[PDB]
């Protein structure tokens, strides 16, 4: 059983055919550096709509502007995507449940990764390595350059709670194509 998130939604026709196509967890990019960044009140528009969980992904932001964001823009989940200290993390998580991101290149990232372990744990990649500490993470989800033709291969190696995309399907930054939502879920949840 894995769950599918569809990361980078600028606009509700995306969003709600994500949901069709069998999405659970839909993702909004609250970085402005982004080409895929959303403001918050256009994302309440968005968010407020639908019936799964909605994710907002912060980088570097303090926690006071990630609250206030979550809150108005009826946020279920928040992914934490820099360098925040655990004790950052942990103050946040008292208020709203929070996934951290890791970036994972070679092995020194994943013991730094295991000091985050009492939080979902999303990897920024190879999934060759993931396997000797697989069992150590409470909700590891995957995420990095997957696509239709690559998540199957992802999926029978890490065998991860839920997998993360973005431009892996899309026609352009921020705009979704359809054909690639529904063929992307299809293949990884096995249809």
Same mark, same amino acid.
């Given at each position: 059983?894995?769950?599918?998130?569809?990361?980078?939604?600028?606009?509700?026709? %995306?969003?709600? #055919?994500?949901?069709?196509?069998?999405? %659970?967890?839909?993702?909004?990019?609250?970085?402005?550096?982004?080409?895929?960044?959303?403001?918050?009140? %256009?994302? @309440?528009?968005?968010?407020? $709509? !639908?019936?799964?969980?909605?994710? =907002?992904?912060?980088?570097?932001?303090? /926690?006071?502007?990630?609250?206030?964001?979550?809150?108005?823009?009826?946020?279920?989940?928040?992914?934490?995507? =820099?360098?925040?200290?655990? $004790?950052?993390? @942990?103050?946040?998580?008292? @208020?709203?449940?929070?996934?951290?991101?890791? *970036?994972?290149?070679?092995?020194?990232?994943?013991?730094?990764?295991?000091?985050?372990?009492? #939080?979902?744990?999303?990897? &920024?990649?190879?999934?060759? !390595?993931?396997?000797?500490?697989? &069992?150590? #993470?409470?909700?590891?989800?995957?995420? *990095?350059?997957?696509?239709?033709?690559?998540? @199957?291969?992802?999926?029978?190696?890490?065998?991860?709670?839920?997998?993360?995309?973005?431009? =892996?399907? $899309?026609?352009? /930054?921020?705009? +979704? %194509?359809?054909?690639?939502? +529904?063929?992307?879920? +299809?293949?990884?949840?096995?249809?």
């Amino acid at each position: 059983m894995v769950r599918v998130k569809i990361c980078g939604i600028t606009n509700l026709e %995306d969003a709600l #055919f994500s949901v069709e196509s069998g999405a %659970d967890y839909v993702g909004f990019v609250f970085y402005p550096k982004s080409k895929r960044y959303i403001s918050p009140e %256009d994302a @309440r528009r968005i968010s407020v $709509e !639908l019936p799964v969980e909605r994710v =907002g992904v912060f980088v570097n932001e303090e /926690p006071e502007k990630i609250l206030d964001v979550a809150s108005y823009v009826q946020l279920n989940a928040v992914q934490l995507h =820099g360098e925040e200290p655990i $004790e950052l993390c @942990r103050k946040i998580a008292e @208020r709203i449940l929070v996934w951290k991101a890791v *970036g994972v290149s070679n092995e020194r990232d994943m013991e730094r990764a295991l000091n985050y372990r009492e #939080f979902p744990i999303l990897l &920024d990649t190879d999934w060759s !390595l993931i396997l000797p500490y697989r &069992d150590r #993470f409470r909700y590891l989800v995957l995420s *990095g350059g997957l696509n239709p033709e690559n998540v @199957r291969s992802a999926i029978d190696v890490v065998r991860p709670f839920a997998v993360d995309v973005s431009s =892996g399907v $899309e026609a352009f /930054p921020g705009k +979704k %194509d359809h054909d690639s939502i +529904k063929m992307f879920i +299809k293949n990884a949840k096995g249809l």
